[PDB]
Each structure stands twice: as C-alpha cells, then as structure tokens.
Amino acid sequence: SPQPLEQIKLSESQLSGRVGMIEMDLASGRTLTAWRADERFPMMSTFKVVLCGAVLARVDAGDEQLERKIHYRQQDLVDYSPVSEKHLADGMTVGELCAAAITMGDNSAANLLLATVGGPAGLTAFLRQIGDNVTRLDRWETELNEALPGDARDTTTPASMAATLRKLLTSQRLSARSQRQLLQWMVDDRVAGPLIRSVLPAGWFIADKTGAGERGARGIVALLGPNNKAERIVVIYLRDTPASMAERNQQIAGIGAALIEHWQR
Ligand SMILES: OC[C@H]1O[C@H](O[C@H]2[C@H](O)[C@@H](O)[C@H](OCCCCCCC3CCCCC3)O[C@@H]2CO)[C@H](O)[C@@H](O)[C@@H]1O
Known about the structure:
This protein is of the alpha+beta class.
C-alpha cells in the first residue's frame, strides 16, 4: 500500500465522496495525519462513545449508577435493538445499556441513555463542558443518520472527535475506573471488532465503534497500535458517495493498511 495520505486521496477518487481522517497519538495528542480534519461529517453511531462518556461522568459525580436497572416499554424501541428487545420483561442496567449501545450497536439502548443525559441538547452541552465547541447532536436514533447534504445536524469533525475521545479516555476528567470502562466497551465491540481482527496482522491492537448512514455515510473511531498497544486514535468518516457498503468498508480498511505498512512517522 502507498503512504497514508496518498491512500486517503485515492479513496476519494474511487468513491467520489469526501473522506475525513485524523491519526493521533493517544498518550500525547500529537497529530500525525490530518485530512479534511476541520470539515463536518455525520457522526452516525460513533456518537455512542461520547454518549456513554457523559453517562460515566454522571456516575463519577454520584448522579447515576451503572447498576441502576431501567425498565422500558416496547413502544420505546426504535429500529435495530438486538439486545434491548429481549429485556422488555426484566429491564437492563445503565451499564448494560452502554454495553449494548457500544458493542452491539443497539439503537434503543442508545436512545434510553440519551434521555438520561438530557437528550441531544444535554449531550451537546456535555461536549461544550469538556471543551469541544464543534461536535453537536441534534436528533435521536435513527434519524440522526440521515446525512443530508450541507446539514450541520448531528455532526463532528475528525479533529474534534479525536480530541474528544482522547479527553474521555485519558485526561482524568473521568475517574480511573470510568476511563477503563469506556475503553473496555470499545475493546468489546462485536459489530466490527472481530471482523477487523480477522484481517489485522498478528500483534495489532484494535478497539472501535463504527457507524453507517444514508448517502454513503460511514465511519469509525478506533484505537490501534503494534505490540498489542492502543498507541493511536484513528478517526475516519466518509460522506456523499454512492458506493456499495462493501467498497466503502474496503476503502477504510485500505487506509488502515497504509497506516500499518508505514507506521513509523
Ligand atoms: O508488512 C505489514 C503486513 O502486511 C500484511 O498485512 C495486511 C493484511 O493482510 C490486510 O488484511 C490489512 O487490511 C487492512 C486491515 C485493517 C482494517 C481495519 C483498519 C482500521 C483500524 C482502525 C481505524 C480504521 C481502519 O492490511 C495489512 C497491511 O498491508 C501481511 O499480511 C502481514 O503479514 C504484515 O505484517
């Protein structure tokens, strides 16, 4: 594979869409690769990591408990609820809801959690509180995945998302246990985690959260690194491309291949 930046460019050429990408050292925040890093892209389900970061903040403050069991109704369910639809009779704990939202892509679990933090407005306020003055959530699942051209709703920028993720995972804004919990949820992703490992060379660490929307919108926020270490944050978003999901997945994997082959930068 070619250099990272050259591969990213080839991806836009082949997809006819915009690609947004940031490669950042997790420990220090050093930005290695930045492409359309200040441009807006729909977050799609990747917003779920920020969501649970807000939940953990409430837990740290004593305003929430991951153990708290929430009982919900069938009418509360939205499209794609693989875990939540199985607990209409017994409910789910707040912690279980975050695990379902992040590791299984459960949309109803996400909406239930979003309510607890003040909805889209409440989460956006949380982002402003941690210094992210760009990212914004305006809608709920699944409407937030609409990805209309020129629509600023439910968007982030590669730079903002990378910085925010780093803040949640390492800045001590969240307690030690909470930072460890958020990290483990990403490590446990069952939607794309296993698939990615199946194609990663031995020795490479992966933790992630993916998303998919309309008009080709696709994205992934992850931790990646050799020697089984979460060395860098890699954020890649795609938008406005008519390409098949397979090819969009292939292009993102291709950018990853370029990083892997040319890691020392
Ligand atoms: O010399 C480097 C490596 O070259 C290949 O590895 C290939 C691998 O066979 C392929 O499956 C993958 O595709 C990409 C797999 C990663 C896809 C997800 C990447 C994510 C990471 C988080 C942010 C978004 C992208 O590319 C690599 C690099 O050429 C060899 O198989 C391996 O023995 C060797 O160590």
